[model samples]
Target: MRRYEVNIVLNPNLDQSQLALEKEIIQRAAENYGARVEKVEELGLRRLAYPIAKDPQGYFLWYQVEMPEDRVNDAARELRIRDNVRRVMVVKSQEPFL
Candidate 1:
């Protein structure tokens, strides 16, 4: 399976329950696109290099997923349009170069 690192940037103002709900939506979206989620990491709120939608900080969620390479783009597109999601990016993952 091809591996990918999915980065989700969400609105910083979201409450805990809202955050949890949004997370589930993202995971489900990935699954629907044929991605098997391997891991999820919450990075809490961090300062953005520049303001996005008038927000200087964003809550970040990192995800590791495996699926066919062709499906990754579709998953990313879905996430990008989701409510509370500020940004979505997918990077191919593999062993680090020595």
Candidate 2:
């Protein structure tokens, strides 16, 4: 197993309730992939460096996860399939936070 940083950008058009639900969905998705999520940070709304799907802003969420290296790609693919997810990036990290 290894640590990875999961950064997710959600559609800015999502309302408050949808935002909450989306977060839950994301967490569950990670667990389904056998990832042990260590930390979840709400980075909030941020302007995108470049427009995506015609949106200039995105709601950012970050996750610190520990899972088998081989499964990281599968987890990222699952996240990208969600309707509200605009982008999902995973990076290998040096160490676990806790």
Candidate 3:
């Protein structure tokens, strides 16, 4: 197995329930791809460096998971198609921490 980090920025307009639902969807995706979620961190809402969909702020979140190398692409695709996801990044690691 390999380790990966996924950072996601969600639309700022979503209410608490919407945000929670989005988080759950992401967790589900991770599980579906045979990945185990190691940690989930909510970074709260913050101003974006630049506008995204004309929005200047978004809710930031982090997901640490362990899975096969090939499954990362599937995770990225799922996040990209979600309307509420402003941005998502999946990065592989060579070291345990960087």
Candidate 4:
């Protein structure tokens, strides 16, 4: 399995319940791929360096997981189809760091 860091930006308009649901969706994706999720960090809301969808800020979330390289694409696809997800990026790690 390859380790990866996933950074996601959620739409700021979502309420607390929606935010929690978004997290659950991501976790389900990980589990579906037989991935081991090391950690999920809620970085909370933060100002965007540049606006997205005309929004000035977004909710930041980070996830660390170890899974087969091919499955990363699956996770990306799921995030892309979710309305609450503004953006998502995954970087393969050279090793398990941070």
Tell me, by lDDT, which candidate is best: 2
| Residue 13 Cα positional deviation in candidate 4, in Å, after optimal superposition | 1.4
TM-score of each: 0.92, 0.93, 0.90, 0.88
* Candidate 1: tens digits of C-alpha lDDT, residues 47-95: 9988889999999998888888988777777778877999888888875
Clashing pairs in 1: none
Best model number under TM-score: 2
Which residues of candidate 1, in runs, are more than 4 Å off? 95-98
Query: How many clashing pairs does model 4 include?
Result: 0
Global CA lDDT of candidate 2, please? 0.91
- Kindly give the stretch of ten consecutive residues in candidate 2 with the minimal lDDT sum: 89-98
Compose the digit string of candidate 2's lDDT tens values, residues 1-98: 98889999999999989999999989998988889889999999999999999999999999998898888888889889988999999998877577
Steric collisions counted per model: 0, 0, 0, 0
List all candidate RMSDs to the true structure: 2.5, 1.2, 2.1, 1.7
Write model 4 residue lDDT over 3-79, tens digit each, in one string: 89889999999889989998988888878987899989999999998988999999999888889998789878878
Q: Residue 50 of candidate 1: its Cα lDDT?
A: 88
Q: Which pairs clash in the backbone of model 3? A: none
Model 1 TM: 0.92
lDDT of 4 at 97: 54
> What are the runs in model 4 whose C-alpha is more than 4 Å off?
94-98
